[PDB]
Amino acid sequence: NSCELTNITIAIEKEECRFCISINTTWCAGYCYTRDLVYKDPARPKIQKTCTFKELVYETVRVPGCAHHADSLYTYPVATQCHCGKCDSDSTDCTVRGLGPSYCSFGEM
Amino acid sequence: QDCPECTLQENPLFSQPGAPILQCMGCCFSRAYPTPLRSKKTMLVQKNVTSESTCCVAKSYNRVTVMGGFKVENHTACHCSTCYYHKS
Amino acid sequence: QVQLQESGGGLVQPGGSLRLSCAASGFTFSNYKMNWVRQAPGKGLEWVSDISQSGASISYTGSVKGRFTISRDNAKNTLYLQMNSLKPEDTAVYYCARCPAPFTRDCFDVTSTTYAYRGQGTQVTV
Amino acid sequence: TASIAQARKLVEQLKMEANIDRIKVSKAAADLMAYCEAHAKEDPLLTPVPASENPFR
Amino acid sequence: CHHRICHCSNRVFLCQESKVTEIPSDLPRNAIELRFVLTKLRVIQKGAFSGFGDLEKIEISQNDVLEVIEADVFSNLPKLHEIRIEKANNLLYINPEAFQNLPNLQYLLISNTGIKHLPDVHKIHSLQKVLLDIQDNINIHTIERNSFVGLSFESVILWLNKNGIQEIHNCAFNGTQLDELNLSDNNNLEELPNDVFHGASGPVILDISRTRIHSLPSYGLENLKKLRARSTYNLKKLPTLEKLVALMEASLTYPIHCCAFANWRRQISELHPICNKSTYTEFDYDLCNEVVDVTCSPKPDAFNPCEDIMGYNILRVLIWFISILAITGNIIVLVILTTSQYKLTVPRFLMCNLAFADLCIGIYLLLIASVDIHTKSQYHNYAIDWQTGAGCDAAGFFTVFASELSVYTLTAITLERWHTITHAMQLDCKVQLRHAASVMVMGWIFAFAAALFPIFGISSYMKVSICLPMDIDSPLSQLYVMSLLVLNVLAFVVICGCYIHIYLTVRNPNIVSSSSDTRIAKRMAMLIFTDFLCMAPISFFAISASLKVPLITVSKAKILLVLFHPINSCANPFLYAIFTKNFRRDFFILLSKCG
Amino acid sequence: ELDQLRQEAEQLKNQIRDARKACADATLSQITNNIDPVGRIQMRTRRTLRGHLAKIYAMHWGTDSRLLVSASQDGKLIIWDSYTTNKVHAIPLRSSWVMTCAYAPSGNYVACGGLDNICSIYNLKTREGNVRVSRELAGHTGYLSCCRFLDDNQIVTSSGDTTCALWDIETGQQTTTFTGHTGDVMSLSLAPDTRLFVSGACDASAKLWDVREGMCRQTFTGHESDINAICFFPNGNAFATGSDDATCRLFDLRADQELMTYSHDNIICGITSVSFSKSGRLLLAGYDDFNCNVWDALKADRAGVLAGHDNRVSCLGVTDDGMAVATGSWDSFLKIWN
Amino acid sequence: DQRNEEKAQREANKKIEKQLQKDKQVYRATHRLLLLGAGESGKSTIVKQMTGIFETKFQVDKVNFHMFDVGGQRDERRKWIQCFNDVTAIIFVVASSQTNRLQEALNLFKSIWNNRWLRTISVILFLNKQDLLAEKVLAKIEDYFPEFARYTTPEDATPEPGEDPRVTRAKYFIRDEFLRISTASGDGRHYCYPHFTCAVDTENIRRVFNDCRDIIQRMHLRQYELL
Ligand SMILES: CCN(C(=O)c1nc(-c2cccs2)c2n1CCc1cc(OC)c(OC(C)C)cc1-2)C(C)(C)C
Ligand SMILES: *[C@@H]1O[C@H](CO)[C@@H](O[C@@H]2O[C@H](CO)[C@@H](O)[C@H](O)[C@H]2NC(C)=O)[C@H](O)[C@H]1NC(C)=O
Ligand SMILES: CC(C)CCC[C@@H](C)[C@H]1CC[C@H]2[C@@H]3CC=C4C[C@@H](O)CC[C@]4(C)[C@H]3CC[C@]12C
Ligand SMILES: CC(C)CCC[C@@H](C)[C@H]1CC[C@H]2[C@@H]3CC=C4C[C@@H](O)CC[C@]4(C)[C@H]3CC[C@]12C
Ligand SMILES: CC(C)CCC[C@@H](C)[C@H]1CC[C@H]2[C@@H]3CC=C4C[C@@H](O)CC[C@]4(C)[C@H]3CC[C@]12C
Ligand SMILES: CC(C)CCC[C@@H](C)[C@H]1CC[C@H]2[C@@H]3CC=C4C[C@@H](O)CC[C@]4(C)[C@H]3CC[C@]12C
Ligand SMILES: CC(C)CCC[C@@H](C)[C@H]1CC[C@H]2[C@@H]3CC=C4C[C@@H](O)CC[C@]4(C)[C@H]3CC[C@]12C
Ligand SMILES: CC(C)CCC[C@@H](C)[C@H]1CC[C@H]2[C@@H]3CC=C4C[C@@H](O)CC[C@]4(C)[C@H]3CC[C@]12C
Ligand SMILES: CC(C)CCC[C@@H](C)[C@H]1CC[C@H]2[C@@H]3CC=C4C[C@@H](O)CC[C@]4(C)[C@H]3CC[C@]12C
Ligand SMILES: CC(C)CCC[C@@H](C)[C@H]1CC[C@H]2[C@@H]3CC=C4C[C@@H](O)CC[C@]4(C)[C@H]3CC[C@]12C
Ligand SMILES: CC(C)CCC[C@@H](C)[C@H]1CC[C@H]2[C@@H]3CC=C4C[C@@H](O)CC[C@]4(C)[C@H]3CC[C@]12C
Ligand SMILES: CC(C)CCC[C@@H](C)[C@H]1CC[C@H]2[C@@H]3CC=C4C[C@@H](O)CC[C@]4(C)[C@H]3CC[C@]12C
Ligand SMILES: CC(C)CCC[C@@H](C)[C@H]1CC[C@H]2[C@@H]3CC=C4C[C@@H](O)CC[C@]4(C)[C@H]3CC[C@]12C
Ligand SMILES: CC(C)CCC[C@@H](C)[C@H]1CC[C@H]2[C@@H]3CC=C4C[C@@H](O)CC[C@]4(C)[C@H]3CC[C@]12C
Ligand SMILES: CCCCCCCCCCCCCCCC(=O)O
Ligand SMILES: CCCCCCCCCCCCCC(=O)O
Ligand SMILES: CCCCCCCCCCCCCC(=O)O
Ligand SMILES: *[C@@H]1O[C@H](CO)[C@@H](O)[C@H](O)[C@H]1NC(C)=O
Ligand SMILES: *[C@@H]1O[C@H](CO)[C@@H](O)[C@H](O)[C@H]1NC(C)=O
C-alpha cells in the first residue's frame, strides 16, 4: 500500500517555563484501500484499514528551563517502521481527525 | 501505486444484466502520528499514537429488493467518510 | 501267623532241571513283592530273583539270567521258580523271602540275617 | 550251636503260654463295654465339657 | 459561513477555541454538522441541540473540563445520525434524559470517557440500525437490567469492550435484536447469568476474548454464528452441539475445544439460489461457498487427539477386564501370603511388594476406564479440568510410582534368586529379611521421588489425557523422563544377565539329562519374555519420542499402554505366586478356616 | 534233632491256633451293634508350638497334663508348658539322632535316646538350677526305639537288638533283660497297673512281658508287616497296635486274639503312633499321609480326622486326664487339639 | 500375685529362645552327610584320610560338613535309615569284583533310591578300590554279569591318559549299571553323582563339596519353581 516512512517536525512544550522547541523524526502516512458493501450481513468481514507503526525506539535531549529549573532530559519513543493493517485499538487512538502532530501551546507554528 | 479515488463501480453478483446496483469503493487518505501532550491531558486510557482515518461509503442510496427477496442498497452517491469498523 | 514254606529240592544231575515253589499264608499275597534268596555252604545269603505284585517286572542275577524263571499265582498264593541247566555252584539252601511292606518297591532287608519274613528253605544239591 | 537252645527256649515259652486261663470273649467284651459305659461321663473328648471348664478355652 | 467564536466550512462548525465556555445559541439552526473540540465547555446545558433541522452529525471531543451533560440535550432532530462523545476524562455523569427519540440515528459513540454508567438509550427509538460503541470507559462496573431496550426498532451492533465491567445483570439484552455483542478485554467480568439473552434475538456474533467468563448462557445462542473466545482460560466447558445449531466459526482458547466440532455433522446447508447462479480479494464476491463446514482455531495438536479416552470401543471393554483381572489376582495373592501362619521370608516379602505395585497399576487402569466411561462422547468438556486438575496428577503419580516399584521389586526378586543360587554354599553372605527390607525401603523412596518430581514442575502430567509424563519441553523434564526409561531398560538387562548366569551356574551335563536343562531354560524364558513384551513395545516408542523423534501418535499410544503395560501386572501374580506349592498349600489352609 | 524240634513247634502252634479258634464266639463288631456310634468328631487345633529346628520323633505328656517333652533329630530336648506355649527347658543332647523320649511319673527325670545306643536321663529339678545328666545307660547293641518310666528309679527300654531290658537307675545295670523277639522292637507301652508291658517288633508280632518274672506271657501274630506303635487300653485288659500294613488291631490279653481290626480301602499308608482316650472309646492313630484318624474303638468307624500337619505324624499322645491330644510331626510343629 | 511366676517363665523363655536362635545359625550352616557302604568298602580309609554311630567333621572352603557313619548297627536298615530323610546327600561307597558283592551293592542302592523317604535325597556314588579294579581287569567280570559282553564303552567317556581300554569299559559298565538303577526308577526329584576314587585321593572332599553345592542349587531352583 501507499504508506512509507517520512520526515515530520514535531514539537514539545514545557509547562513550567512556557516555551517550546522543535525536532524532526520519521513517521508514516498515506493510503490504504477500502470498499463499501451493498448487502447487509453481520458475519461479513468489513473492509477498512490504515497504515500504522510497527516498532519504536526512544531518544533524549536537554530542554532548558526557567529560574531554578533548567536543562532537563526529555524522552519519547520514535518510530522505525510502518505497516498497513487494522488500527490497533489497544495502543493507538483511531480518530476521525485530531489536533495535528505539530503544535506549541505557548506559540503558534 | 496510484490507487483509484473513492468512486462508484459495478456489481458483478447482485445486479441482473441491465439492472445495475452500483457499489462505492476507492482509496482515501489516512495517517498516524504521536499524541500531543495537550491531547494526552484529556485521555483516561493513554495512547501513544493517533490515527486519522477515512472510509469510502455511500452519501445516499436507494434500497431495492432483488433476486427473490435479497434487499440491497444502490449507491446513488459515494464519498469517503468516518470509518465505523476500522477498529481492531 | 505269617509263614512261608518251600517245596522241592534234592539232588539234581549237572545240567538237569528242577522246580521250587513257596506257599504263603497269613498275608495278602497280591499286595506284596517277593524274592528268592539262596545261601551256599560257607557263604552268605545271595539274592536270586524278584517278581512284583502284578508280575510285569522281573529281574535276576548275572549268574542266573536266562537259566531260572520266576512266576507267581495271586489266586493260589504261591511263589514259583523254574530251574534248568543247573550247575555245581547252584548248590545252596533256597529261601522264599517276602518284602517288608506292601505297596512299595523297596525290599531292603530280604537278604539280611535272621529275617522275619522268610521260610525255612529247602536244600538243592548238584 | 544256639539253634537247639533257641528251639528249647521256644517250646518252653509256648508250653507256659498255653497253660493259662483264657476267659471267654463275650465276658471280656462285656467288661470293656461296662468300663466304657461307667467312665463315659468323665471323658471330655467324648462329651464336650463347658467352655468355662475347658482349660484351653 | 462564519460564527462569532467558532470556525465553519460549508455550514459545518468547528468550535476549537478556549473562548467557548458555553454552547453558542447563536449558531445557525441550519448547521449541517457541529464539532465541539477542546471548547473548554464545562457543562452541556439542557436543550442545547434542540431544533437544529439540518444537523446530521454532532461531535463532542477533547473537552477535559466537561463535567455534566443535562437532559433534553440531543432533542429529536430528524437529520442527526452520528454522535461522538470522546476523550472526556472528567465527564462522569450524563443525564438519563439526555437522549430522546431520534428516528434516524445510525451511530453513537461515548468511548473514552469517565461516564460512571451506560447512556440511557431506552428513548432513542431509532428506525435505522444503530451501532453502539462504548469502549475504553474504565469506570463502568456493572450493567443494569434492560439496559439496551428501546434503542431502535431495527437490529443493533453492541460493542461494550475494553471496559471495567465486572458483572452482567439478568435480562441485560432482553427485548433487543442483537447482531454483534463484543465484550472483549473486560477482564473483571467473571460470569454470565443464564438469563443474559432471555427474551432476546441473537447475537449473531459473540466475542468474549480476554475475559474470565466461566460458561456461556444455556440458551439463546442458536442464532450465534461466529464465536470469539481467545485468551479465555476460564471457559473450560462449552454448550452441547445441539444448542450451537447455526455455528459457523469459533476462535477458542484451548486446542481440544476446537474439535467439539469434529466433523461435518451439521446436516443442513442453506444453498440460496442467488449463490447458485442468480483491491477486491474478499470471498470472490460470493456468499454461500462451502459455508456449511465449521471453522475453528487453534487446530488440535498432536498431543490432543480428541477421541474418547478410549478411542475405540474394543479398548474400552478390554481395559475393564484387564483392570479387574490385575486387581483381583494381586489382592488375593497379597492376602494369602500375608495371612499365612508360616514365617515370612525374603521371596514372600518381595512378592507382596510386587503385588502391591501391580495392584496400583490395576487401580490406575480402573481410574482411567472409569473416567473414560464418565466422559464418554463428551471428553472435550472435561479434558481441561481433568488434565490440569488434581485428578490427572494423582493418576500420573499412580502409574509412575507403581511402574517404578514393580520394576524395582522384580529386579530385587531376580537378584535374590541369583544370590541364593550362585552363593548357596557361602552361607556367611545369607540375605536376611532385614537386608531385603532396607532394599525395599530404598525402592519405595525411589518410586515416591520419581512420582513426585512431575508434580513439582519437573515434567507435568497434563500433556496427555491418560496422564503419562510426556513433558519434553524443558531440559530437566527430558533428563527426568529419560532416567526413568533408561533405568527401566537397565532393569530388564540386569534380569536377563542374572538369569543367564544362573543357567550357566546350574547346568551340569555330566549328571543332569538334557531335558532338565531345557526345562530350566524354558521356565526362565517365560519370565524374561513376559517382561520384554511388557517393556520393549512401550519403551521403544517412549525413548524415541523423548529424544524428540516421535514415531507414533498418542492415539495408538493409548492402545499400546492399555494392551502391553498391564502384562506384568496380570502375569506377575500368576507366574511368581499362584500355582506355587507354598501358595497352593496356603490357599487350601486358609480356605479350610473359611469353610 | 532240628527236624524233631521243628515238628514239635508246629504241633504246639497248631494246638494254639485250635484253642484260639475255639474261643472265637463273635467279632467285637457283632456284639457292639447295640451301641450307638460316636458320630462326627471335629477336633480343631488349639495351640501350635514352634522352635524345633528338625523333624520331631517323640513326645510324652507329663502326669500334670501340662508339661510336654519333645525330642527332635536336631539334638534338642525342649520341654513345653502346653497351657502357656512357653518353653520351660531346652536340653542340648550329646547325639543329634534321638528316637524316643519319656517323662518320669514323679516329674523329676526325663529320658531319651536313639542311634547312639545310650539312654540319656536328665534331672530337671537340680540344685544348680540347670539341666544335667543324672546317668547314662549302655549295653544295648542297637538303636533305642522306645523307653518308658516305671517309677522314679526304674526305666524300661526297647531297642533294635530284638530285646528289651529293665534298668535300675541307681546302679545303672540291667536288672533283667527280655528276649524272644526276632525283629527290631519299635514301640513300648506300660500297663496302667505298672505290672506288665506289651512290646511291638518288626516281625508282625506283639509280646506281653511281665516286669518282675522277666518272661513273656502272650504272643499276638494278627498283623502283616512291622509293628510301629502300641498302646494299652485304659483298663489294662487290652492293647492296640499299628503296623505298615495300614491296619490297626485291638488285642485282648484275656481272649488272646485280635478282637477288632480297623482298616479302610483308601488308606495305603502305615500307622506311626497310637493312643487311647481316657474312656477308651476313641482310638487315635497317626498315618504317613500327614494326618491322624480317630477310630471308634467299638464300632470301627472313622469318627474324624486331624489334618493340620504338613509332614509325617511321628508321635502322638493324650493326657492322663484326657483333656487334649498332642501330636508331633516331621515339620517340627507340635499340635494340640481340643 | 500370679505375675511373679509369669515373669520368671517369660525370662526363661527368652533365655532359651536366644540360645535356640544362636544354635539355629550353626545348624543351618552345616551340611549333613550319611556315609553308607559295605564293610569291605574303603569308607574306613575315606574317613581316616578326611557309641553305635561314628562322626567325622571337616570343612572345605570355609563351609561346615557333618558326615555320619553307622557302624554299631544290625544288618537290617529299613528303620533307622528313616532318620536320614533330611541329609544333603548320601555318600555311597562300592567296591570292585571275590563273589558278586556288586549285585548286593546294587540292590542296596536300589532300595535307598526307591524308598518313599530318601526319595528326595540325592546320592553321591563312590566307586572305590579303583587300583584293585585295574589290577584285576589287567590280569572275569562277564561271569558275574553276562551283559558285559554286549556292552561297549560310552562315546562320552573321558578316561585318564594311558588307561587300558578294557579297564575303562569295566569302569563305565559298573557306573552305567548304577546309573540305570538311578534313571530307570525314580524321577527328577533327585540325582546320582558317580565318581571314581581310591583310598589315596584328596579330591574326595572337593568332589563332595561340588556335589553338595549342585544339590543345594537344584533345591533352590525347585523352591523358586524354576525346576
Ligand atoms: C509406561 C512407561 N512410563 C511412562 O511414563 C511413559 N509411557 C509412555 C507411552 C505409553 C504408550 C506409548 S508411549 C510414555 N512415557 C513417558 C514418556 C513419553 C514421551 C512421549 O513423547 C513425548 C511419548 O509419546 C509417544 C510417541 C506417544 C510417550 C511417552 C513409566 C515411567 C510410568 C514407567
Ligand atoms: C507511551 O507513552 C507513555 C507516556 O505517556 C510511556 O510511558 C513510559 O513508560 C516507561 C516504561 O516503559 C517509563 O519508564 C516512563 O517513565 C513512562 N513515561 C513517563 C512520562 O512516565 C510509554 O513507554 C509509551 N509507550 C507505550 C507502548 O506505552
Ligand atoms: C469375567 C468377567 C467377570 C469380566 C468382567 C465383566 C466385563 C465383561 C464387564 C465389566 C465392566 C463392563 C463395561 C462397563 C461399562 C460399559 C459402558 C457401556 O456403554 C458399554 C459396555 C461397557 C464397556 C461394559 C462392558 C462389559 C464390562 C467390560
Ligand atoms: C481396590 C480398592 C483400592 C478399591 C477400588 C475402588 C474403585 C471402585 C474406585 C477407586 C477410585 C474410584 C474412582 C475415582 C475417581 C472417580 C472420578 C469421578 O468423577 C467418577 C468416579 C470415579 C471414576 C471413581 C469410581 C470408583 C473407583 C474406580
Ligand atoms: C493407594 C491405593 C492402594 C488405594 C486406592 C485409592 C485410590 C482409588 C484413590 C487415591 C487417590 C484418589 C484420587 C485423588 C484425587 C482425585 C480428584 C478428585 O476430585 C476425584 C477423585 C480422584 C481422581 C481420586 C481417584 C481415586 C484415588 C486414585
Ligand atoms: C503410597 C501410595 C501407594 C498410597 C496412596 C497415596 C496417594 C493416593 C497420594 C500420595 C501423593 C498424593 C498426591 C500428592 C500431591 C498432590 C497435589 C495436589 O495439588 C493434588 C493432590 C495430589 C496429586 C495428591 C493426591 C494423592 C496422592 C497421589
Ligand atoms: C544410567 C542413568 C540412570 C543415567 C541418566 C542418563 C540420561 C539421563 C542421559 C544419558 C544420555 C542423555 C541424552 C543424550 C542425548 C540427547 C539428545 C539431545 O537432542 C537431547 C538430550 C538427550 C536426550 C540426552 C539427555 C540426558 C540423557 C538421556
Ligand atoms: C540401558 C542401556 C541400554 C544403556 C543405553 C541406553 C540409552 C541411555 C542410550 C541408547 C541409545 C542412545 C542414543 C543413541 C544415539 C545417540 C545420537 C548421538 O547424539 C549420541 C547420543 C545418542 C542420543 C544416544 C544417547 C544414549 C542412548 C539413549
Ligand atoms: C548393578 C549390579 C550390581 C547389578 C547386579 C549384578 C548382575 C548384573 C550380575 C549378573 C552377572 C554378574 C557377573 C557374573 C560374573 C562375574 C565374574 C566374577 O569373577 C566377578 C563378578 C562378576 C563380574 C558378576 C558381577 C555381577 C553380575 C554383573
Ligand atoms: C533363560 C534364558 C536367558 C536362557 C537361554 C540360554 C542362554 C542364557 C545361554 C545358552 C548358551 C549361552 C552362551 C554359551 C557360552 C558363553 C560363554 C560365556 O563366557 C559368555 C556367554 C556365552 C556366549 C553364553 C551366552 C548365554 C547363552 C546363549
Ligand atoms: C518362553 C518360551 C516358552 C517362548 C517360546 C520360545 C522357546 C521355544 C525358547 C525359550 C528359551 C529357549 C531355549 C533357551 C536355551 C537353550 C539352550 C541351547 O543350548 C539349546 C536351545 C535352548 C534349549 C532354547 C530352545 C528354545 C527355547 C525353549
Ligand atoms: C527394548 C528396546 C527396543 C529399547 C531400547 C533401545 C533404544 C535405546 C533404541 C530403540 C529405538 C531407538 C531410536 C529409534 C530411532 C532413532 C532415530 C535416529 O535418527 C536417531 C536415533 C533414534 C532416536 C534411536 C535411538 C536408540 C533407540 C531409542
Ligand atoms: C495383553 C493384554 C490382553 C493384557 C494382559 C492379558 C493377560 C490376561 C495375560 C498376559 C500374560 C498372560 C500370562 C502369560 C504366561 C502364563 C504362564 C502360564 O503357565 C499360565 C498362564 C500365564 C500366567 C498367562 C495368564 C494370562 C496373562 C496374565
Ligand atoms: C479373574 C480370575 C481369572 C482371577 C481370580 C481367580 C484366581 C484367584 C483363581 C484363578 C485360577 C485359580 C487356581 C486354579 C487351580 C488351582 C489348583 C488347585 O489345586 C489349588 C487352587 C488353584 C491354584 C486355584 C487358586 C485360585 C485361582 C488362582
Ligand atoms: C472392590 C473389589 C474390586 C472390584 C471393583 C469394581 C468396581 C466396579 C464399579 C465401578 C463403577 C464406575 C462407573 C463409572 C463412574 C461414573 O458414573 O462416572
Ligand atoms: C520421597 C521422599 C524424598 C523427598 C522427595 C521430595 C523431592 C522434592 C524435590 C523438588 C525439587 C524441585 C526443584 C524445585 O522446584 O525447586
Ligand atoms: C540384551 C539382553 C541380554 C543382556 C546380555 C547381558 C550380557 C552379560 C551377561 C553377564 C553374565 C556373565 C557372563 C560371563 O561372565 O560368562
Ligand atoms: C528526511 O530528512 C533527512 C534530513 O534530516 C534527509 O537526509 C532524508 O533524505 C529525508 N528523508 C525523507 C524520506 O524525507
Ligand atoms: C423482557 O422482554 C419481554 C419482551 O420480549 C418483555 O415482555 C418483558 O417485560 C421483559 N422483561 C422485563 C423484566 O422487563
By CB atoms closer than 10 A (0-12, 13-18, 19+), residue E429 is: exposed
Burial E77-104 (b: 16+ CB within 10 A, else e): beebbbbbbbbbbebeebbeebbbbbee
Q: Where are the domains of chain B?
A: 1-88
Coil, helix or strand at residue D21: coil
- Any idea what DSSP says for residue A86? S
The C-alpha atoms of residue C21 and residue C95 are separated, in whole angstroms, by: 10
- CB distance G80 to G59 below 8 Å: no
Is beta strand F196-201 parallel, antiparallel or unpaired with respect to F206-210?
antiparallel
Identify the domain containing residue D21 by its residue range.
3-57
Count of domains observed in chain D: 1
| Number of Cβ within a 10 Å radius of residue C6 | 22
Q: Is G133 exposed, middle or buried (0-12, 13-18, 19+ CB in 10 A)?
A: buried
Distance from CA of E179 to the nearest CA of A (A): 6
Task: Return the half-sphere exposure (C-beta side, CA atoms, 13 A cut-off) of residue G194.
Answer: 22
- 3-class SS at C87? coil
3-state secondary structure at position A54: strand
Cα E6 to chain centroid distance, Å, stands at 58
If you search the block for the grid coordinates 443494569, which residue do you land on?
Answer: E144
Nearest residue, CB atoms, A89 vs list E157, E162, E225:
E162
**The C-alpha cell that represents F80 in the structure block:** 513345653
CA E102: distance to chain centroid? 46
Q: What is the C-alpha to C-alpha distance for residues F188 and F231, in angstroms, rounded to an integer?
A: 7
Rg (C-alpha) for chain C, rounded Å, is 14
Q: Residue E126, SS3?
A: strand
Contacts of E138 in chain B (CB under 8 A): 44-45
CA torsion angle F253 F258 F264 F269 (round to 10): 70
- The phi and psi torsions of E512 (rounded to 5 degrees) equal -95, 130
C-alpha radius of gyration, chain B, whole number:
18
Total Cβ atoms within 10 A of residue G59: 11
| CB E591 less than 6 A from any atom of ligand 8 | no
- Run of H or E including E8: strand E7-9
For cell 470401543, the residue is: E313
Residues flagged as binding site of G for GTP: 37-45, 69-73, 128-131, 199
| Per-residue buried b or exposed e for F251-269, using 16+ beta carbons within 10 Å of the residue's own CB | bbbbbbbbbbebeeeebeb
- Beta strand E43-44 with E68-69: parallel, antiparallel or unpaired? parallel
Q: Nearest CA of chain G to the CA of F81: how many Å?
A: 10
Residue F289 · residue F305 · CB < 8 Å: no
Q: Number of helices (H) and strands (E), helices first, in chain F? A: 2, 28
CA nearest to G9, candidates F82, E222, E304, E352: F82
Helix G130-138 / helix G165-184 crossing angle, nearest 10 deg: 120
d(CA A67, CA A82): 42
Instruction: Quote the ligand 9 centre to E504 CA distance (angstroms).
Output: 13
Is residue E235 within 8 A of residue E251, CB to CB? The reply is no
Q: Is F33 exposed, middle or buried (0-12, 13-18, 19+ CB in 10 A)?
A: exposed
Distances (CA, A) of E366 to E321, E372, E455, E470, G1: 10, 10, 21, 21, 58
Cβ atoms within 10 Å, residue D39: 18
**Record: contact B13-E274, CB cut-off 8 A:** yes
Beta pairing class for F173-179 and F163-168: antiparallel
Coil/strand/helix, residue F61: strand
How many CA atoms, within 13 angstroms, populate the side-chain half-sphere of residue E113? 27
**G41 closest CA partner among G136, G132, G122:** G132
Among candidate residues F45, F41, F42, F39, the one with its CA nearest the CA of residue F324: F45
Q: List the CATH number of the domain containing C105.
A: 2.60.40.10
Q: Look at E427 and G217 and tell me if their CB atoms are within 8 Å.
A: no
- Distance CA(F226)–CA(F232), nearest Å, equals 18
Comparing CB atoms, the residue among F24, F323, F336 nearest residue D25 is: F24
The span from the CA of E73 to the CA of E43, in Å, is: 11
Render the burial of E148-159: b for 16+ CB within 10 Å, e for the rest: bbbbbeebbbbb
CA distance E473 to E478: 7
Residue F301 to residues D30, F37, F318, G173, Cα–Cα distance (Å)? 20, 8, 20, 54
Phi, psi of E39 (to 5 degrees): -65, -20
Cell of G181: 538303577
CA dist A108 and C102 (Å) reads 137
Tracing cell 441482473 back to the chain, one arrives at: B16
Q: Number of C-alpha atoms within 13 angstroms, CB side, residue E590?
A: 17
Closest CA to E483 of E450, E523, E438: E450
Q: In CATH, what number is assigned to the domain containing residue D23?
A: 4.10.260.10
The DSSP code sequence of G90-145 is: EEEEE------HHHHHHHHHHHHHHSSTTTTSEEEEEE--HHHHHHHHH--HHHH-
Nearest C-alpha of chain G: how many angstroms from C57? 12
Closest of G88, G196, G72, G222 to residue G133, by C-alpha: G196
Measured at the CA of G94, the angle between CA G88 and CA G100, to 5 degrees, comes to 145
> Domain limits of chain A?
1-109
Question: CA E399 to CA E406: how far, in whole Å?
Answer: 10
**How many domains are there within chain C?**
1
Cα torsion at F8, F14, F15, F19 (round to 10°)?
160
- Cβ A29–B1 below 8 Å, yes or no? no
Rounded Cα gap, residues F87 and F84, in angstroms: 9
Among chain F, residues having any CB pair with chain G shorter than 8 Å are 51, 53-55, 57, 73-74, 76, 78, 81, 84, 86-90, 92, 95, 97, 99, 114-118, 141-143, 145, 160-161, 183-184, 186, 202, 226, 288, 330
Q: In angstroms, what CA-CA distances link F213 with D8, F177, F252?
A: 19, 10, 21
Experimental method: cryo-EM
Q: For chain C, first and last CA: distance in Å?
A: 34
Are F99 and F144 in contact by the 8 Å Cβ rule? The answer is yes
Burial class (CB in 10 A: 0-12, 13-18, 19+), G39: exposed
Contact F208, F216 (CB under 8 A): yes
Q: What number of other Cβ atoms are within 10 A of residue B74's Cβ?
A: 20
SS3 G59: strand
Cα distance between residue F73 and residue G82, in whole Å: 11
Query: Three-class SS of residue F201?
Result: strand
Determine the residue among E58, E63, E135, E179 to mutate to test chain A binding: the one whose Cβ has the most chain A Cβ atoms within 10 Å. Answer: E179
Q: How many CA atoms lie within 13 A of B53 on its CB side?
A: 31
Peptide bond into G194 cis (omega under 30): no
Residue count (chain B): 88
The reported resolution of this PDB entry, expressed in Å, is 2.8
Ligand nearest to the CA of E492: 17
3-state DSSP call for residue F209?
strand
Q: For chain A, how long is the longest CA-to-CA vector?
A: 66
Q: Would you put residue F302 in left (φ > 0), alpha (ψ -120 to 50) or beta? A: beta
Alpha carbon distance, N-terminus to C-terminus of chain E: 115
**Ligand 13 centroid distance, CA of E521 (Å):** 19
In this complex, whether B and A touch, counting 3 or more CB pairs under 8 angstroms, is yes
Neighbours of F280 (CB within 10 A): 23
C-alpha to C-alpha distance for G82 and G119, rounded to whole angstroms: 11
Contact at CB, G86 and F74, closer than 8 angstroms: no
Q: What's the CA gap between E26 and E4, in Å, rounded? A: 8
**What sign does the dihedral C38-C40-C44-C47 (CA atoms) show?**
negative
In order of E254, E544, E546, E553, the CA distances from E301 in angstroms are 10, 19, 17, 11
Q: Which domain holds residue C17?
A: 3-124
| Residue G146 per-residue DSSP state | G
Residue matched to cell numbers 507354598? E582
Cα distances (Å, whole numbers) of residue E316 to B86, E311, E378, E392: 52, 8, 15, 19
Residue in C120, C92, C97 with CA at minimum distance from that of residue C50: C97
Q: Which helix (H) or strand (E) holds C122?
A: strand C122-125
Grid cell of F76 as nine digits:
534338642
> Which of F284, F291, F289, F327 has the alpha carbon at shortest distance from F307?
F291
Put simply, the answer to whether G27 touches F84 (Cβ < 8 Å) is: no
In a 3-state reduction of DSSP, which class is residue E49? coil
Q: What is the DSSP letter of B70?
A: E
**Cell numbers of E296, please?**
475453528
User: Which residues share a beta bridge with A47?
Assistant: A35
CB atoms near residue F272 (< 10 Å): 24
Residue B48 burial (CB < 10 Å; 0-12/13-18/19+)?
middle
| DSSP E strand stretches across F211-311 | 215-220, 227-232, 238-243, 248-252, 257-262, 271-276, 282-287, 291-296, 302-306
Q: State how far the Cα of E72 lies from the Cα of A1, in Å rounded to an integer.
A: 46
- Are F272 and F290 in contact by the 8 Å Cβ rule? The answer is no
- Sequence-distant (≥ 6) Cβ neighbours of residue E390 within 8 angstroms: none
Q: Half-sphere exposure (CA, 13 Å, Cβ side) for F196? A: 18
Compute the C-alpha angle E401/E406/E411, nearest 5°. 130
Whether E87 and B84 lie within 8 Å, measured CB to CB: no
Round to whole Å and give the CA distance between G145 and G158: 23
Residue F331 CA: distances (Å) to CA of F54, F312, F328, G85: 7, 7, 8, 12
Least Cα distance to E89 among A105, A94, B47, B41 occurs for B41
Grid coordinates representing E567? 502384562
Over the range F8-32, which residues count as b (16 or more CB within 10 Å of their CB) and which as e? eeeebeeebeeebeebeeeebeebb
DSSP three-state, residue E594: coil
Return d(Cα F257, Cα F48) in angstroms, integer: 39
Query: In the structure grid, which three cell numbers stand for residue F127, read together?
Result: 540344685
Whole-angstrom Cα distance, residue C110 to residue G75? Answer: 10
CA atoms within 13 A on the CB side of E92: 1
- A40 shares contact with chain E (CB less than 8 Å): yes
Alpha carbons A25 and A80: distance in angstroms, whole number: 10
At residue G208, what are phi and psi to the nearest 5 degrees? -65, -40
Q: How many CB atoms lie within 10 A of CB A106?
A: 11
φ, ψ at F173 (rounded to 5°): -135, 155
Buried b or exposed e, range E267-279, using 16+ CB within 10 angstroms: eeeeeeebeeeee
* Assigned C-alpha cell, E33: 454538522
- For residue A77, is the peptide bond before it cis, meaning its omega torsion is within 30 degrees of 0? no
3-class state of residue F207 by DSSP: strand
List domains and CATH numbers for chain F. Answer: 1-337 (2.130.10.10)
